[PDB]
């Protein structure tokens, strides 16, 4: 009876749109296009076309090399058995070199050399993907907000994989390539350094991840509720204020006493998302290098609880 | 304000209130110093 | 690990980020103040001075040679609204004096948008009837919607669908043209139109069902369809006209029937 | 001097000044309360 | 009528309960009947938080902890100093969150909008209710709820997680974490794309949605569109919240033991072992 | 909340369950 | 006094008052159930 | 007095009243079940 | 003094006043209940 | 001086002042209740 | 050096300068408080 | 501003208050140095 | 040399230069503070 | 045969070829550095 | 038979064939290097 | 600015303040070197 703007009732199909012309020297888009009816129910049904310049070629080739290295090490770990591969996939892992190697770049291949090679190729692929997003933004005359948002995640990735192990002089501090193995690394990292809950930057990164979930929920709900007035056409609302922008501002002003604009809300969202990984990388980098016991550090700063503040024995006993 | 007259009136009121505030704070700080000095 | 006294590197980094985040919150508030500010008094309409932390005005370089926007220079709404306060207080609501849908009060209010149509990146009108689009067609397995009956909020059949308006940029249906019993053609937003007889679960269900294929618009009644704002030029709709039509239909969820404005109790 | 009011709105300036003064005063009072030397509530 | 366009929108009607009784504003805030209920419940909850804190070992806001009653007390109403304060604050929080949802619904009706925001917030309300009402009821004791303390509920999270070995091996926990990470990536992408569209470089004009489509097709070969991105973000956030609630509700009631041992089911599938 | 008291529940857990 | 009905409507006020009375009565009854002196269900 | 039905819809009032009665009855029955004195299922 | 009603309407003022009075009364009663000295329910 | 009312609206000023006074008074009373020296409910 | 006022708005420049001075002086005072040599509150 | 004259007046006021502020800070630093030198 | 002012706006260049100088100076001062040889606050 | 260049752009082909050669050469040099037999940097 | 090129575009076919052959050759060389019998770099 | 003479004026001001700033920094560095040298 009432349309809720969740699924597109009637889809419009036509010739594929190949994109606006580039303002720089670009090689030309690879015109491989498709159409998915079920994606058109939620968003746009068009698949493609794609752009494959120098940066895309480098990124794809080096990432394929790294993924092939990890997968072939998984196959060797499984004894080349497809059934063992399937059975132990979650437990297969390409592990970093042991502590006896320090941060040496020369490790035997089966003892960590493949790990270092895969890390190098993955880093090359990620950096070239960032350069590709920068050049794609530049070719259309657009801003560099997405490159900086990606740079924040890359900062966390590089701190996890290279920068922190380099500063500690220990390859064994790096994250292994595996499904359950990198979760085990996460848990062990929390265990050896006291308790990562008491890292203030881990708490800040959690604050920003939670707040980004909150912000996307609120913003998506507001925009979909404003579909009756063209809320999703945000570019035009920003450059020509309509009743959708006014209603969106007034809803949140009446709810919580303050509001953003159709442009300011996206700045809020961008900053929350960026700050998540920025604070995460900062907190990980200082762990072990600066602070070795975060619970002790919290005790020194009067925010570490004791049993006389709260005793969790009952909660443990209930969960057994 | 825009006119110099209202600006001077505003400044006069602000200065009077500031002087009273500083006098009260000075009395309180003198009492605290006679009670528990923080220099020595 | 200590820099001096009990000061350490981690504490210094945390304090630096705390100060940066306070500055970022101030900047975000400054950005959020660009529309609708400065504030004004509820009764007299007296404009407030303005923030001490505000900077310069923002200017948007519009495409298609439309100039600059400058959202801080958008004209303030008229203080005299077609309504009267329920009680004399700064927080009382306004009861519309006449027809809220015609006068634009509450959910039926509209903004003073640009009086020219939105354009594609190459300068063609963005929202056009599907015949004027560039080889844009309805999905063959999707409802055709042409000639289907239209149901109003009072369950009356206001008329039928005579045309489909699509967005040439986003490839989406934006408006349905409805020819009423009197023969007048009006635009209805696709976001207020429920299509019946095309349920995914019903298609999955292994049944032979002759469900009636029609379009239901529960925002406004059949009579109100005769007061939908009209277009100045056929085949073209401006931003102002889009806002007018969307506000007229959106305000019906409160104003189509009196009971829609009453509490459940 | 008085010419400062040709550039600052008195309402905004006063509100900001008093917000800052409130933050400062509460911070100083809490710091004093947290010290055993200057705490005036726990002991007689 | 503070904003330059606000006055025409401030009309009567759209309330679910109360009609014209509480249909007014206080500053920017709309009140309504559910605003009155929200104010009462939230103010009482805050006052009782601080009243219980004043009875506790410290007034340090980091170390304040309003704790639930002991597990031995079961599901009974405890004395206030022995966990009853926590129970009253929990009831106040439930009432406040439900009233917030209903006030959002009333405000949505007043502005001619649908109920997307109240439902989206009700997902998080359901997550909280699962954490501190449904799970303790299923487990048989209020002592299973997390304390009302800034740093002690992190201790509750840590200890409950380690009571199951490694909580990373909960598969619903995996799904919720994946939804959270994908949501944050999507929010970064959406904010960046909108900002880059409205803040061009090189002296160019403000872009059209065709430019956003072109950018994301040149980037990764697919663009979801302006409506699709908001739909997908809402889906991701709501799924993250809902699957968080599901993952916590099943641990300790349906599944008891180490979550690591659960994955022994995979190794016993006769296809590969 | 149940119809029992916290003291009664604690006494039942101690004596009727943990003591016998 | 009766003039209170010139500013508040009886139909809405009755609903609000009865909701408040319900919550208050439930709170008082639950508080009574939590005390050994007044609990009327756990023991004879 | 039937005056009430002039100001309150009978359908909405009946639905709300029955919802409240159902919740109250379920709460009381669960509370009675929770106590050993009044539990009518665990023991003979 | 009566001129306070020139600046505050009676409806919103009464609503806010009674919300605050309810919150304060419940807070004080709960605080009294939490102490052994002023708990009027637990002992005879 | 009376001229302060040419720059500050009495309605907004009084409401802001009383909200602040309330929060400060509740903070002070709660702080006093925490200390055993000034607690007036725990002991005779 | 007065020509700088041709390039910067006086109100914004003053606000930014005062904010920076406040932040810097709070940082210095906090650093001094964190040293035993210069702490002026903990001990007599 | 635009007129050089009011810019010079603004510079005069700024210089006067800056000199007062710096003199106060210098007195405070001299007192602190006489109390607890940090170079020695 | 003066031709550099034909390529860079004076306001933007000055602001960026002073921000960079502030960051560098604070970094150097903090690094000096962390060292034992150059710390000037710990000891006499 | 030269006719291969009637179906593949020389620029794209050269870019892909040199990217592949770069990956291969880096892999081989890394593998050689991984072995003690061929590592030319660890020892004399 | 040459007619296979009526149904298959040779640009796509060549790209896919050369990618697959590179992956296969890398896999075979990796497997050989992983075995002690065929490793040609570890020992003389 | 666009006109060269404004560029010379801006350069004069910039170099004057830069030389003063560098002289202050040089005096501070010389005092530090006399206090605690970092080469030796
Ligand atoms: C026992 C477990 C520990 C714990 C140990 C850790 C450790 C260790 C870390 C975190 C980190 C985080 N923790 Mg934790 N954490 C705990 C409990 C929690 C709880 C909770 C109980 O509710 C929450 C909400 C969190 C939340 C968080 C996040 C806020 C944060 C990482 C978010 C992120 O950016 O995504 C992850 C995003 C990235 C990793 C960026 C990735 C971007 C790159 C470029 C992607 C490359 C992909 C590649 C091209 C794909 C192909 C690859 C090939 C197939 C190989 N933790 C407890 C205390 N947590 C991280 C952090 O930064 O915090 C300080 C971190 O390192
Ligand atoms: C040792 C710790 C364990 C662990 C044990 C647990 C346990 C136990 C729990 C989780 C839960 C979560 N964990 Mg875990 N978890 C671990 C490691 C991680 C890592 C990581 C990188 O290592 C990550 C990303 C996570 C992430 C997550 C999320 C999936 C989830 C928390 C989000 C949520 O619940 O939202 C839902 C949102 C809410 C519940 C909030 C609702 C908000 C309410 C309605 C509004 C509040 C209003 C407020 C009062 C207003 C005041 C504001 C102003 C004053 C006005 N965990 C490790 C292995 N984890 C929790 C979960 O899934 O359950 C829900 C869960 O209980
Ligand atoms: C050891 C301490 C002594 C004590 C020593 C003192 C001293 C000394 C003083 C007082 C003062 C006050 N004491 Mg005493 N007082 C004690 C115990 C109490 C108890 C109790 C435990 O029952 C109560 C109710 C009070 C009550 C009061 C107030 C009547 C008065 C503050 C006036 C005021 O402006 O409030 C502030 C509140 C408002 C301005 C708002 C109006 C309140 C209404 C009901 C709304 C409530 C708001 C709601 C609860 C929450 C909203 C919060 C925010 C608005 C968001 N005292 C104990 C016994 N008391 C002060 C006084 O006399 O001032 C004139 C004072 O100097
Ligand atoms: C003990 C085993 C012997 C050995 C036994 C054999 C046998 C038997 C054969 C070879 C063959 C080859 N050997 Mg041999 N070979 C050995 C060691 C080497 C070493 C080395 C580092 O020591 C190198 C560089 C090579 C090189 C080669 C190739 C020239 C050739 C396989 C290419 C191919 O099939 O085309 C497939 C690839 C393409 C058509 C396109 C690839 C072009 C791109 C630009 C080059 C990059 C390739 C690289 C794998 C890309 C990595 C990225 C991926 C995404 C992973 N061999 C050892 C010493 N070798 C085969 C041959 O002679 O011709 C077929 C063959 O039959
Ligand atoms: C999709 C699920 C996610 C989500 C959704 C989201 N959040 C939302 C919304 C949406 C769509 C709103 O519309 C709503 C809003 O209006 O924001 C402005 C809101 C909101 N999300 C909020 C918080 C929040 N959301 C959280 C989580 C999430 N929000 C999710 C991950 C978190 C987490 C992870 O903990 C926080 C803290 C608030 C900012 C706001 C809800 C406002 C509200 O509830 O108003 C009531 C008024 C009050 C004054 C609060 C009640 C006071 C209590 C009675 C006292 C305190 C009791 C509490 C239990 C103490 C315990 C605290 C300790 C744990 C420290
Ligand atoms: C595009 O459209 C959009 C916008 O603008 C157009 C947006 O602004 C927004 C909103 C988003 C933002 C402004 C960004 C910032 C938001 C963030 C970080 C998330 C929310 C988190 C926060 C900490 C914000 C604050 C949250 C709160 C709940 C504060 C609430 C505070 C108060 C005082 C509420 C008071 C109101 C009541 C209790 C109800 C009414 C009752 C009364 C007035 C009481 C009356 C009685 C008495 C006694 C006074 C969205 C989502 C959007 O999509
Ligand atoms: C949605 C949930 C509704 C729950 C019922 C409820 O919310 O109860 C309401 C408030 O309860 C409250 O917040 C306090 C609830 C405390 C629960 C413990 C009752 O409000 P009213 O009687 O209208 O007015 C109270 C008068 O003082 C006028 O101000
Ligand atoms: C690390 O932190 C610790 C440990 C605390 C150590 C460090 C502490 C530090 C660094 C503190 C620094 C503090 C500081 C650093 O400047 C403070 C400055 C305070 C100042 C300048 C206060 C000034 C107050 C002025 C007041 C109250 C004026 C009020 C005027 C009023 C209300 C006038 C009203 C008016 C009137 C009557 C009539 C109308 O016609 C016109 C009008 C005008 C409307
Ligand atoms: C690592 O960190 C530690 C440990 C702290 C070590 C390092 C510390 C470091 C690196 C510190 C560096 C500091 C620094 C590095 O430059 C500081 C500079 C400070 C300066 C330049 C202060 C200047 C102050 C000027 C003031 C207050 C001027 C006020 C003028 C006013 C209010 C004038 C008003 C006016 C008047 C009357 C009349 C009107 O007509 C015109 C108008 C104008 C309106
Ligand atoms: C760390 O924290 C602790 C531990 C607590 C320590 C620190 C504590 C600190 C720093 C506290 C600082 C407090 C502080 C720092 O200034 C307080 C100031 C309080 C003041 C200024 C209170 C003033 C009250 C004035 C009142 C109530 C006036 C009411 C007037 C009314 C209602 C008039 C109404 C009217 C009437 C009749 C007639 C109409 O015709 C006109 C009209 C006008 C409408
Ligand atoms: C089907 O079979 C085939 C083989 C065809 C395909 C197989 C595909 C499969 C099964 C692949 C599976 C892959 C999986 C499961 C991977 C999972 C990975 C996870 C979960 C990783 C998590 C985190 C990883 C991080 C953070 C890694 C970071 C690494 C970095 C940043 C490394 C940097 C290294 C550098 C810069 C190289 C330095 C080189 C040096 C020092 C020599 O010189 C500078
Ligand atoms: C009007 C309806 C308000 C409640 C909508 C549902 C909230 C979320 C339930 C999970
Ligand atoms: Fe958006």
């Amino acid at each position: 009876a009432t349309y809720q703007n969740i699924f597109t009732q009637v889809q419009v199909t036509g010739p594929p749109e190949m994109g606006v012309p580039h303002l720089d020297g670009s090689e030309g888009r690879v015109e491989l296009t498709g159409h998915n009816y079920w994606l058109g129910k939620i968003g746009q049904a068009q698949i493609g076309p794609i752009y494959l310049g120098l940066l895309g070629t480098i990124s794809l080739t080096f990432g394929a090399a790294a993924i092939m290295i990890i997968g072939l090490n998984f196959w060797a770990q499984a004894g080349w058995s497809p059934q063992t591969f399937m059975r132990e996939f979650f437990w297969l892992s390409l592990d970093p070199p042991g502590p006896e190697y320090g941060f040496s770049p020369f490790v035997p291949l089966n003892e960590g050399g493949w790990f270092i090679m895969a890390g190098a190729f993955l880093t090359i692929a990620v950096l070239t993907w960032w350069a590709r997003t920068y050049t794609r933004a530049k070719a259309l005359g657009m801003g560099m907000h997405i490159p900086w948002a990606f740079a924040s995640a890359i900062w966390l990735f590089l701190v996890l994989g290279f920068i922190r192990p380099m500063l500690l002089g220990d390859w064994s501090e790096a994250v292994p390539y595996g499904i359950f193995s990198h979760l085990d690394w996460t848990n062990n990292f929390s265990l050896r350094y006291g308790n990562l809950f008491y890292n203030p930057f881990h708490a800040l990164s959690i604050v920003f991840l939670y707040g980004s979930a909150v912000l996307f929920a609120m913003h998506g709900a507001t925009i979909l509720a404003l579909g009756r007035y063209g809320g999703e056409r945000e570019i035009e609302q920003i450059t020509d204020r309509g009743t959708a922008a006014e209603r969106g501002a007034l809803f949140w002003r009446w709810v919580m006493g303050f509001n953003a604009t159709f442009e300011s809300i996206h700045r809020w969202a961008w900053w929350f998302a960026v700050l998540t990984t920025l604070t995460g990388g900062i907190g990980i980098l200082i762990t072990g290098t600066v602070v070795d016991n975060w619970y002790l550090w919290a005790q020194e700063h009067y925010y570490a609880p004791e049993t006389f503040n709260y005793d969790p024995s009952g909660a443990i006993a209930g969960s057994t | 304000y825009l006119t110099p007259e209202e600006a001077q009136e505003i400044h006069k009121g602000f200065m009077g209130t500031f002087v009273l505030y500083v006098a009260i704070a000075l009395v309180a700080h003198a009492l605290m110093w006679a009670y528990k000095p923080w220099f020595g | 690990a200590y820099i001096v006294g009990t000061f350490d590197v981690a504490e210094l980094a945390f304090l630096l980020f705390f100060g940066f985040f306070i500055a970022l919150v101030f900047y975000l508030n400054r950005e959020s103040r660009r529309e609708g500010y400065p504030l004004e008094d509820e009764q007299t309409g007296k404009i407030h001075p303005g923030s001490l932390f505000d900077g310069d005005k923002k200017a948007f370089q519009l495409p298609h040679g439309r100039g600059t926007y400058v959202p801080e220079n958008v004209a303030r709404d008229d203080i005299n609204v077609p309504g009267v306060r329920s009680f004399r207080s700064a927080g009382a609501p306004w009861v519309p004096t006449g027809d809220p849908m015609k006068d634009g009060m509450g959910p039926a209010a509209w903004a003073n948008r640009s009086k020219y149509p939105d354009l594609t990146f190459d300068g063609r009108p963005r929202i056009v009837p599907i015949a004027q689009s560039h080889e844009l067609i309805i999905a063959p397995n999707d409802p055709q919607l042409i000639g289907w009956p239209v149901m109003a909020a009072d369950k009356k059949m206001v008329g039928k669908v005579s045309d489909i308006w699509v967005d040439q940029a986003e490839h989406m249906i934006r408006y349905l043209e409805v020819e009423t019993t009197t023969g007048k053609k009006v635009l209805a937003p696709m976001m207020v139109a429920s299509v019946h007889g095309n349920s995914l679960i019903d298609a999955l269900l292994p049944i032979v069902e002759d469900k009636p294929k029609f379009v239901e618009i529960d925002a406004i009644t059949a009579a109100q369809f005769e007061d939908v704002p009209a277009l100045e030029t056929p085949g073209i709709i401006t931003r102002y006209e889009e806002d007018r039509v969307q506000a007229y239909f959106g305000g019906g969820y409160m104003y189509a029937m009196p009971e829609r404005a009453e509490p459940w109790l | 001097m008085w010419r400062i009011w040709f550039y600052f709105d008195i309402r905004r300036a006063l509100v900001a000044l008093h917000v800052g003064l409130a933050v400062l005063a509460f911070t100083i009072h809490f710091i004093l309360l947290s010290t055993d030397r200057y705490n005036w509530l726990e002991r007689a | 009528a503070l904003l330059s366009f606000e006055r025409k929108y401030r009309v009567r009607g759209g309330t679910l309960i109360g009609g014209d009784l509480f249909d007014f504003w206080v500053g920017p805030f709309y009140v309504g009947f559910f605003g009155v209920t929200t104010a009462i419940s939230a103010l009482l909850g805050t006052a009782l938080i601080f009243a219980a804190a004043a009875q506790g070992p410290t007034l340090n806001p980091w170390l304040i902890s309003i704790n639930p009653p002991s597990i031995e007390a079961g599901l009974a109403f405890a004395p206030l100093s022995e966990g009853g304060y926590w129970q009253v604050i929990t009831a106040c929080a439930v009432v406040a969150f439900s009233s917030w949802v209903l006030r959002q619904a009333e405000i949505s009706r007043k502005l001619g909008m649908s109920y997307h925001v109240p439902i989206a917030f009700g997902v998080a309300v359901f997550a909280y209710v699962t954490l501190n009402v449904i799970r303790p009821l299923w487990m048989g004791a209020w002592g299973n709820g997390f304390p009302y303390g800034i740093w002690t509920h992190l201790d509750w999270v840590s200890n409950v997680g380690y009571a199951f070995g490694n909580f990373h091996y909960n598969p619903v926990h995996m799904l919720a974490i994946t939804f959270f990470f994908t949501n944050c990536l999507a929010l970064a992408l959406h904010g960046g794309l909108v900002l880059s569209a409205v803040n061009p470089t090189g002296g160019t004009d403000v872009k059209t949605p065709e430019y956003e489509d072109t950018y994301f097709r040149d980037f990764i070969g697919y663009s979801v569109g302006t409506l699709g991105i908001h739909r997908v973000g809402l889906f991701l956030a709501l799924n993250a919240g809902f699957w968080s609630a599901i993952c916590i509700v099943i641990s300790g009631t349906l599944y008891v033991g180490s979550w690591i041992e659960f994955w022994d089911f995979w190794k016993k599938i006769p296809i590969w072992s | 909340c149940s119809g029992n008291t916290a003291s009664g529940n604690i006494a039942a857990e101690q004596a009727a369950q943990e003591a016998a």
Side-chain angles (χ1 to χ4, degrees), chain A residues 3-8 17 19-20 22-23 29 39 41-44 46-51 83 86-88 90-91 129 132-133 136-137 140-147 149 180 183-184 186-187 191 195 197-198 203 209 212-213 215-226 228-229 232 234-236 238-239 241 243 246-247 250-257 259 263 266-267 269-270 273 276 302-305 308-310 312 314-316 318-320, chain E residues 2-3 5-6 8-10 25 28-30 57-58 60 62-63 65 67 71 100 103-104 107-108 110-114 116-117 120 135 139 143-144 147 151-152 154-160 162-164 166 168-169 174 180-181 183-184 186-201 204 206-234 237 256 263 266-267 271-273:
Chain A
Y3 182 52
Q4 299 302 331
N5 202 19
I6 305 298
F7 303 102
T8 296
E17 310 293 311
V20 304
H22 293 126
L23 319 173
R29 274 173 281 248
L39 280 172
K41 225 86 163 63
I42 282 316
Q44 294 189 111
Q46 189 186 310
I47 323 283
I50 60 149
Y51 181 87
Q83 284 180 110
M86 300 186 264
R87 179 199 325 124
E88 304 287 331
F90 304 138
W91 297 264
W129 202 252
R132 156 201 192 77
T133 207
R136 287 313 95 212
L140 296 183
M142 287 174 105
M144 299 303 126
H145 304 79
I146 287 176
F180 286 171
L183 306 185
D184 290 335
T186 309
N187 178 70
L191 286 173
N195 184 358
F197 280 139
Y198 295 97
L209 181 78
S212 312
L215 272 181
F216 224 144
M218 290 156 54
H219 176 61
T222 313
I223 291 306
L224 295 183
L226 287 171
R228 297 170 177 166
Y229 318 97
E232 78 284 336
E234 312 185 288
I235 289 174
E236 283 65 50
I238 287 159
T239 56
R241 196 186 73 222
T243 205
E246 293 174 347
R247 287 158 204 253
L250 283 191
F251 178 90
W252 291 110
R253 188 174 190 76
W254 298 352
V255 164
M256 40 182 211
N259 60 275
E263 182 182 3
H266 294 98
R267 323 203 79 107
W270 187 95
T276 312
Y302 326 113
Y303 71 93
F308 64 80
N309 298 115
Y310 158 67
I316 299 159
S319 321
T320 84
Chain E
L2 290 306
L3 295 185
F5 49 78
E6 182 167 5
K8 51 189 209 271
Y9 292 100
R10 282 199 170 189
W25 285 260
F29 303 93
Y30 175 75
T58 187
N60 180 344
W62 292 141
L63 300 186
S65 181
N67 304 324
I71 290 274
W100 199 262
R103 195 178 74 117
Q104 281 181 332
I107 292 161
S108 320
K110 202 176 278 279
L111 286 162
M113 315 170 20
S114 332
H116 294 77
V117 178
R135 201 186 171 254
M139 288 186 75
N144 295 293
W151 286 99
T152 50
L154 265 62
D155 296 14
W156 177 93
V157 169
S158 196
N159 282 282
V160 168
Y162 281 120
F164 298 94
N166 188 2
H168 279 148
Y169 285 88
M174 280 154 206
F180 269 108
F181 286 170
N183 188 255
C184 191
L187 193 64
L189 289 186
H190 175 54
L193 193 57
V194 171
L195 289 176
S196 81
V198 294
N199 287 157
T201 57
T204 59
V206 165
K207 273 79 187 81
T208 54
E210 283 122 329
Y211 278 85
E212 305 182 295
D213 261 293
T214 305
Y215 177 80
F216 252 94
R217 276 156 190 164
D218 294 338
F219 194 25
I220 58 149
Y222 175 70
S223 182
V224 79
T226 52
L227 193 54
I229 192 53
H230 294 100
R231 277 151 177 204
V232 167
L234 186 57
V256 177
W263 292 96
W266 181 273
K267 308 217 165 148
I271 296 166
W272 40 78
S273 182

Side-chain angles (χ1 to χ4, degrees), chain D residues 1 3-4 7:
Chain D
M1 64 153 52
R3 256 161 290 231
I4 197 97
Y7 321 98

Side-chain angles (χ1 to χ4, degrees), chain C residues 1-258 260-265:
Chain C
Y2 288 130
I3 288 172
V4 56
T6 38
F7 206 56
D8 50 283
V9 184
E11 210 204 318
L12 169 60
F14 176 79
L15 294 178
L16 280 168
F17 185 82
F18 186 53
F20 157 78
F21 184 75
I22 293 152
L24 178 67
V25 164
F26 268 83
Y27 160 82
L28 285 162
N29 288 347
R30 187 200 77 175
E31 296 308 304
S32 292
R33 267 180 247 115
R34 290 200 190 280
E35 295 271 19
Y37 275 77
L39 302 191
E40 56 178 305
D41 182 62
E42 271 102 347
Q43 322 246 46
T44 65
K46 179 221 261 174
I47 308 178
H48 294 193
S51 177
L52 266 202
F53 302 92
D54 274 341
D56 280 312
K57 297 176 172 173
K58 180 157 198 355
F60 285 102
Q61 189 180 306
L62 302 181
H64 313 117
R66 268 101 174 261
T68 185
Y69 170 53
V70 193
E72 276 100 332
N73 290 351
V74 174
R76 306 183 73 91
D77 291 31
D78 189 22
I79 189 181
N80 309 290
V81 290
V84 48
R85 319 209 65 171
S86 323
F87 50 100
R88 26 198 168 68
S89 151
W94 270 273
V95 185
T97 51
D99 198 310
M101 263 165 114
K102 254 156 267 174
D103 295 338
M105 281 285 279
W110 66 83
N112 273 323
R113 294 205 103 197
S114 299
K115 288 214 154 63
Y116 43 71
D118 259 310
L119 298 177
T120 69
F121 83 99
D122 37 339
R124 306 171 296 130
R126 203 181 289 171
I127 331 262
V128 295
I130 207 207
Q132 264 81 264
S133 60
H134 188 280
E135 281 217 5
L136 259 49
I137 58 133
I138 307 301
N141 56 318
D142 261 352
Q144 288 328 108
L145 286 187
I146 299 275
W148 289 29
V150 183
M151 203 186 246
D154 42 1
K155 308 307 135 41
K156 285 198 227 284
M157 293 332 257
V158 49
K160 293 179 179 179
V161 179
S162 57
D163 207 8
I164 293 168
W165 287 52
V166 297
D167 190 296
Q168 283 196 104
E170 321 252 23
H171 289 227
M172 191 105 183
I173 299 184
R174 292 263 183 244
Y175 295 99
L176 294 172
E177 214 209 65
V178 177
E179 171 158 25
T180 76
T181 292
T182 80
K184 195 167 101 146
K185 318 259 195 125
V186 293
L187 258 55
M190 179 72 180
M191 302 270 210
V192 299
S194 270
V195 181
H196 296 260
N198 195 230
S199 285
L200 212 53
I201 311 104
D202 274 45
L204 286 152
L205 250 65
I207 38 157
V208 175
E209 194 52 45
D210 275 347
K211 273 318 269 293
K213 289 175 146 233
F214 68 96
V215 176
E216 166 155 278
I217 293 157
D218 63 336
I220 72 175
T221 74
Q224 266 136 21
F225 267 89
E226 258 67 39
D227 305 282
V228 175
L231 302 168
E232 174 98 73
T233 284
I236 305 282
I237 182 158
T238 69
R239 287 207 199 117
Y240 177 78
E241 284 164 352
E242 280 192 88
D243 228 47
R244 283 308 292 269
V245 171
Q246 280 168 324
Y248 184 79
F249 273 80
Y253 289 105
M254 179 156 300
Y255 295 126
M257 305 135 184
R260 297 185 160 195
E262 293 302 277
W264 190 82
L265 312 155

